[PDB]
Write a protein that binds this DNA or RNA. Structure first.
Ligand SMILES: [K+]
Ligand SMILES: [K+]
Ligand SMILES: [K+]
Ligand SMILES: [Mg+2]
Ligand SMILES: [Mg+2]
Ligand SMILES: [Mg+2]
Ligand SMILES: [Mg+2]
Ligand SMILES: [Mg+2]
Ligand SMILES: [Mg+2]
Ligand SMILES: [Mg+2]
Ligand SMILES: [Mg+2]
Ligand SMILES: [Mg+2]
Ligand SMILES: [Mg+2]
Ligand SMILES: [Mg+2]
Ligand SMILES: [Mg+2]
Lengths: 113, 118, 78, 92, 117
RNA sequence: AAACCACGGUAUUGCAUGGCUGAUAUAUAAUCCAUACAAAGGAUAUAACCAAGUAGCAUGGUCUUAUAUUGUGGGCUGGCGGUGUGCUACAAGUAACAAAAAGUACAACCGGAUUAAUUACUGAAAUCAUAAAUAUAAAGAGGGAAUCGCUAGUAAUCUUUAUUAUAAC
């Protein structure tokens, strides 16, 4: 079983497995399965072809997913860079946007864009 | 010519004369706040009343700057020691800095306050 | 019709109670009542500093006297 | 940020500066600004905490940074931000 | 207190009024329904957990069968007593009107005045 | 702002000084906490070599109408390296979630950092304050030479209160 070209583990619960989709988390994954009539006791290996199709259709209509979500986030960052605001410069330089980070700013340095 | 003598206190409870700095300017701010307190409260109520339309509330917001000085804002007032004028280390319940309060307590000049142990 | 006193809506009871004793103010309202319900502290702030008059009628100015003794106790300037 | 239901904040001094500018250049304000002509002059201000409004389009602002007035020309992408975000105070 | 000549103590103004429901019913000839409605309107005392300070102007105590009213709106001791007495009469008028009962000299005396409302 | 005027100065000398304090810390006590139905342990006080520390305050010498008093914005938070004191974790599932299907999820879905969009709250003013929620879901699998605290209601671990516009690890 794969949704949005993401393989769901067979032995895990459906609402837990859907978190692996870029753009769905705990609270939102639980909403999707219950909206389709699937409770927490249903595992991936218990699903059928019709069940997968319902989930795929519901996600596409309500949520923004892996490729479109990544593009949307990047375009937001690029706009700030072109505007040349304080935050835009920090994104371009590859450092955090907080006021005082001369002592602890390592995570923002390794997660550059 | 004109003179402006520094504010100092000579009290029998302390062997030395006690000087202070910058209490007049803070008193001026406290007087101005009391002067404009009534109008400020009225405009605060109107700007946080949801029953009024936004175009009307925007115009009221401009009254905070045209109808009163910036120095009547309550957030710019600080508490200084009444004897020395120091800001840091103030003990609010007595109104004095920790340096003066400690010495006065040792000689019993603060009612009811004494050393503690337990 | 006869309505027993034990079957009166709480809404009507609240309206009667608040119509007599007043309506309390909630924590976060947008009616503009919170500002007007707070006490005024204009006088309490302006009577905080210890500012006795420089010259008290009938008494000597000890601070002025203190300064004069200091000048006499040391050499004159220029 | 400022609660949305309480509206945007703009300084009274900034508004007076713009009103005077419009009176000086009525033709550009009504017609020229929309065709794409540049502002005939710049407005210097200290109001770094004011919000940029859609009505401020094609205007040139000199925003104080501590030493001089840094030129800032308003673009559509800048609407909704503060004037102080486009005038840097520190330099490396 | 030592500062009496410089500031008036804030606790001089508040006053409280207490009445026993059983005696009040007998004096004014209130019916059982009227008394039951009066108790429901008062309700138990409400104290905020943040400060444990009573916030209910009116409350009913079942153990002592007492109806209590607190008045502290104004700065004057007497002005609060006038306020408290008026509020008590308002409660009686509302309960009596909904559930009329026996007529007593006290009730007739109040009716001629109109409950001072 | 002071009239046979007592100008002001976060200017300088702590190696000219007052006052106050860091720095030996056992032992003892007509002191404090607790006690009244059987007990244990603490707190406070107790005279210093160190030219040790001192733009709170006071003071001798020297300097200065103004090295004074004030308005607006900016800075004290600053694209880099070193490192002290703390908080949150991971080896070790004795974890995690929880209103028990006498449970639920997972097999470090343990850990909760960073960034995007959005809203509320305080305030005259919130890009460079705080909180919540949605998405994102980083380092970390017990740590070199070396080094610190404590010896029982103590270490370890958990909750709460106070100093106290908004804002405590
Ligand atoms: K810490
Ligand atoms: K370690
Ligand atoms: K312990
Ligand atoms: Mg996901
Ligand atoms: Mg200076
Ligand atoms: Mg020394
Ligand atoms: Mg020395
Ligand atoms: Mg030292
Ligand atoms: Mg030194
Ligand atoms: Mg300033
Ligand atoms: Mg600092
Ligand atoms: Mg573990
Ligand atoms: Mg977890
Ligand atoms: Mg493990
Ligand atoms: Mg890993």
């Amino acid at each position: 079983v794969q949704i949005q070209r993401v393989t769901l583990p067979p032995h895990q619960c459906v609402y837990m497995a859907l978190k692996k989709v870029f753009g769905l988390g705990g609270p939102t994954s639980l909403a999707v399965v219950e909206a389709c009539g699937i409770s927490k006791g249903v595992r991936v290996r218990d699903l059928k072809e019709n069940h997968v199709q319902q989930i795929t259709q519901f996600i596409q209509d309500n949520f923004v997913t892996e490729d479109n979500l990544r593009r949307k986030v990047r375009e937001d960052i690029v706009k700030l860079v072109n505007i040349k605001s304080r935050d835009g410069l920090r994104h371009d330089w590859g450092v955090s946007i907080k006021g005082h980070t001369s002592c602890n700013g390592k995570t923002a340095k390794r997660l550059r864009h | 010519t004109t003179k402006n003598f520094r504010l100092r206190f000579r009290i029998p409870q302390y062997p030395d004369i006690v000087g202070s700095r910058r209490i007049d300017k803070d008193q001026t701010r406290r007087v101005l706040y009391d002067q404009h307190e009534v109008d400020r409260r009225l405009y605060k109520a109107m700007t946080r009343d949801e029953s009024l339309t936004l175009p009307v509330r925007l115009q009221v917001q401009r009254l905070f700057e045209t109808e009163m000085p910036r120095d009547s804002a309550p957030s710019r007032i600080v508490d200084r020691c009444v004897l020395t004028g120091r800001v840091r280390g103030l003990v609010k319940f007595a109104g004095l800095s920790r340096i003066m309060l400690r010495q006065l307590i040792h000689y019993g000049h603060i009612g009811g306050v004494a050393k503690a142990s337990w | 019709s006869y309505i027993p006193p034990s079957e009166v809506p709480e809404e009507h009871l609240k309206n009667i109670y608040e119509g007599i004793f007043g309506s309390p103010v909630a924590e976060f309202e947008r009616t503009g009542r919170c500002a007007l319900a707070k006490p005024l502290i204009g006088t309490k702030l302006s009577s905080y500093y210890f500012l006795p008059p420089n010259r008290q009628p009938g008494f000597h100015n000890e601070e002025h006297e203190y300064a004069k003794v200091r000048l006499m106790s040391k050499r004159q300037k220029k | 940020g400022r609660a949305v239901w309480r509206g945007p904040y703009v300084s009274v001094s900034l508004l007076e500066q713009v009103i005077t500018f419009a009176k000086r250049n009525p033709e550009w304000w009504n017609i020229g600004r929309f065709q794409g002509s540049k502002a005939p002059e710049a407005i210097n201000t200290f109001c770094r905490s004011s919000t940029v409004l859609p009505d401020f389009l094609g205007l040139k602002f000199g925003v104080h940074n501590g030493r001089e007035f840094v030129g800032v020309e308003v673009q559509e992408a800048m609407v909704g931000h503060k004037l102080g975000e486009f005038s840097q105070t520190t330099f490396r | 207190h030592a500062g009496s000549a410089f500031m008036v103590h804030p606790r001089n103004a508040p006053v409280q009024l207490d009445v026993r429901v059983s005696d009040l019913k007998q004096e004014l000839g209130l019916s059982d329904d009227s008394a039951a409605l009066l108790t429901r309107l008062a309700g138990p005392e409400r104290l905020d957990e943040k400060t444990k300070r009573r916030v209910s102007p009116c409350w009913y105590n079942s153990e002592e069968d007492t109806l209590s009213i607190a008045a502290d709106r104004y700065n004057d001791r007497e002005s609060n007593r006038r306020l408290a007495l008026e509020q008590l009469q308002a409660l009686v008028k509302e309960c009596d009107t909904r559930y009329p009962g026996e007529t007593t000299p006290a009730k007739q005396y109040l009716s001629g005045f109109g409950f001072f409302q």
